Coordinates of C-alpha atoms and ligand atoms in Angstrom, one line a residue:
Chain A
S1 CA 2.6 19.1 -6.8
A2 CA -0.7 18.2 -5.7
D3 CA -2.1 18.4 -2.0
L4 CA -0.7 15.2 -0.2
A5 CA -3.0 12.7 0.8
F6 CA -1.6 9.9 2.7
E7 CA -2.2 5.7 4.0
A8 CA -1.7 4.0 6.5
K9 CA -0.5 0.3 7.4
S10 CA -3.2 -1.5 9.7
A11 CA -1.9 -3.8 12.8
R12 CA -4.8 -5.8 12.2
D13 CA -3.8 -6.7 8.6
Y14 CA -0.2 -5.4 8.2
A15 CA -1.7 -3.9 4.8
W16 CA -2.1 -0.2 3.6
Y17 CA -5.2 1.7 3.8
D18 CA -6.1 5.3 2.3
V19 CA -6.2 7.7 5.0
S20 CA -9.7 9.6 4.9
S21 CA -8.4 11.9 8.1
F22 CA -6.2 12.4 11.2
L23 CA -8.8 12.8 13.9
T24 CA -5.7 13.3 17.0
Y25 CA -2.4 11.9 18.5
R26 CA -0.7 10.9 21.9
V27 CA 2.4 9.7 23.4
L28 CA 3.0 6.6 25.0
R29 CA 5.1 6.6 28.1
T30 CA 7.9 5.2 26.2
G31 CA 7.7 8.6 24.3
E32 CA 6.1 6.6 21.5
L33 CA 4.3 8.8 18.9
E34 CA 0.8 7.6 17.6
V35 CA -1.9 9.1 15.5
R36 CA -5.2 8.6 14.9
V37 CA -6.8 7.3 11.7
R38 CA -9.8 7.0 9.8
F39 CA -9.7 4.5 6.8
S40 CA -11.6 6.1 3.4
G41 CA -14.6 4.2 2.8
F42 CA -15.0 3.1 6.9
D43 CA -16.8 4.0 10.1
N44 CA -15.0 5.2 13.5
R45 CA -15.7 1.6 14.3
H46 CA -12.4 1.0 12.7
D47 CA -10.1 3.8 13.4
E48 CA -6.6 2.7 14.6
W49 CA -3.7 4.5 16.3
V50 CA -0.4 4.0 14.2
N51 CA 2.8 5.4 14.3
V52 CA 3.8 8.0 11.9
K53 CA 7.2 7.0 10.6
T54 CA 6.5 3.2 10.0
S55 CA 2.4 3.5 9.3
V56 CA 1.9 6.8 8.2
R57 CA 3.1 7.7 4.7
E58 CA 2.5 9.7 0.8
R59 CA -0.4 7.3 -1.0
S60 CA 0.9 4.7 -3.3
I61 CA 0.5 5.8 -6.9
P62 CA -1.3 3.0 -9.6
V63 CA 0.8 3.2 -12.2
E64 CA -0.3 4.1 -16.1
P65 CA 0.7 1.5 -19.2
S66 CA 2.5 4.8 -20.4
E67 CA 5.0 4.9 -18.0
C68 CA 6.0 0.9 -16.8
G69 CA 9.0 1.8 -18.2
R70 CA 9.5 3.9 -14.8
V71 CA 9.1 0.7 -12.7
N72 CA 12.5 -1.1 -11.8
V73 CA 14.2 -3.9 -10.0
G74 CA 14.5 -4.0 -6.4
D75 CA 11.7 -1.1 -6.2
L76 CA 9.2 -0.8 -3.6
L77 CA 6.0 -1.9 -4.3
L78 CA 2.0 -1.3 -2.7
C79 CA 1.2 -4.9 -4.2
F80 CA -2.5 -6.2 -4.2
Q81 CA -2.1 -9.6 -3.2
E82 CA -4.8 -11.6 -4.3
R83 CA -5.8 -14.6 -2.0
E84 CA -9.0 -16.4 -1.5
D85 CA -10.3 -15.1 2.3
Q86 CA -8.1 -11.8 1.5
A87 CA -7.4 -9.4 -1.4
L88 CA -5.2 -6.2 0.3
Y89 CA -2.4 -4.2 -0.9
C90 CA 0.8 -5.2 0.7
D91 CA 4.6 -3.8 0.4
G92 CA 6.8 -6.0 -1.9
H93 CA 9.7 -5.3 -4.2
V94 CA 10.6 -5.9 -7.6
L95 CA 12.9 -9.1 -7.8
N96 CA 13.0 -9.3 -11.3
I97 CA 10.9 -8.0 -14.6
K98 CA 10.0 -9.6 -17.9
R99 CA 9.2 -6.5 -20.4
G100 CA 6.8 -6.7 -22.9
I101 CA 5.6 -5.1 -26.4
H102 CA 2.5 -2.9 -25.8
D103 CA 1.2 0.6 -26.6
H104 CA 0.0 2.9 -23.9
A105 CA -3.6 1.4 -23.8
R106 CA -2.8 -1.5 -21.9
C107 CA 0.9 -2.5 -20.3
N108 CA 1.3 -6.6 -20.4
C109 CA 5.3 -6.7 -18.6
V110 CA 5.3 -9.2 -15.8
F111 CA 6.7 -8.1 -12.5
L112 CA 8.2 -10.6 -9.9
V113 CA 8.0 -9.5 -6.7
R114 CA 9.0 -10.5 -3.1
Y115 CA 6.5 -10.0 -0.3
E116 CA 7.8 -8.2 2.6
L117 CA 5.8 -9.7 5.2
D118 CA 6.5 -13.8 4.7
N119 CA 9.3 -13.2 1.7
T120 CA 6.9 -15.3 -0.7
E121 CA 7.0 -14.2 -4.5
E122 CA 4.1 -13.4 -6.9
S123 CA 4.1 -12.4 -10.2
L124 CA 1.7 -9.5 -11.4
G125 CA 0.6 -7.0 -13.8
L126 CA 1.0 -3.8 -13.9
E127 CA -3.3 -3.8 -12.4
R128 CA -1.8 -4.8 -9.4
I129 CA 0.8 -2.1 -8.5
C130 CA 1.2 0.9 -7.7
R131 CA 4.7 2.9 -6.7
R132 CA 6.0 5.4 -3.9
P133 CA 6.3 8.5 -5.3
Chain B
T3 CA -7.6 4.2 -8.7
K4 CA -6.9 1.4 -6.8
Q5 CA -8.2 -2.2 -6.5
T6 CA -10.6 -2.6 -4.0
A7 CA -9.7 -3.9 -1.4
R8 CA -11.7 -6.7 0.6
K9 CA -10.6 -7.5 4.0
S10 CA -10.2 -11.3 5.7
Ligands
CVM201 O1 8.3 9.1 5.3 C1 7.6 10.3 5.9 C2 6.7 11.1 4.5 O2 7.8 12.0 4.1 C3 6.0 12.1 5.3 O3 5.0 13.4 4.3 C4 4.9 11.3 6.5 O4 4.0 12.6 6.8 C5 2.8 12.0 8.0 C6 2.3 13.1 8.3 C7 1.1 11.9 9.4 C8 0.6 13.5 9.9 C9 0.2 14.4 9.2 C10 -1.3 15.5 10.1 C11 -1.6 16.4 9.6 C12 -2.2 15.9 8.2 C13 -1.7 14.6 7.7 C14 -1.1 13.7 8.4 O5 5.7 10.7 7.5 C15 6.3 10.0 6.7 C16 7.2 8.7 7.7 O6 7.9 8.0 7.4
ZN202 ZN1 5.0 -2.4 -19.7

């Protein structure tokens, strides 16, 4: 097993971002606990306080063409969601898969996902999905 | 590696 690395969900976004480090923590009077995180490739202006249970987890992993078969329907995926204004990684679920015929070099499978945020759906290739460990 | 995200 490799050393655990993490991603965290931004409150000004709802997308998930690789975490560079955890600076400190705090406990609100409600009892709510939060850690302060630094996002990889970002200066300290972008640091956030996030809940550990809902907004921090093990990094999603890009899936190799060779293992597309491990991905299944109903699965949770970190999906690179391309739009005009923003391109970002959001959670989604696999509604359907159309399998394809391909060598390990490249995957031509088609995954239909439902984004958790809005419930909207999009079809994605392997290149835009990551799997949970 | 992941796709290079671009923020709003
Ligand atoms: O799920 C779990 C997951 O299993 C667990 O590893 C994850 O751990 C998150 C730990 C966050 C704090 C920790 C402090 C030391 C440096 C690394 C970050 O929390 C998730 C909360 O839902
Ligand atoms: Zn495939």
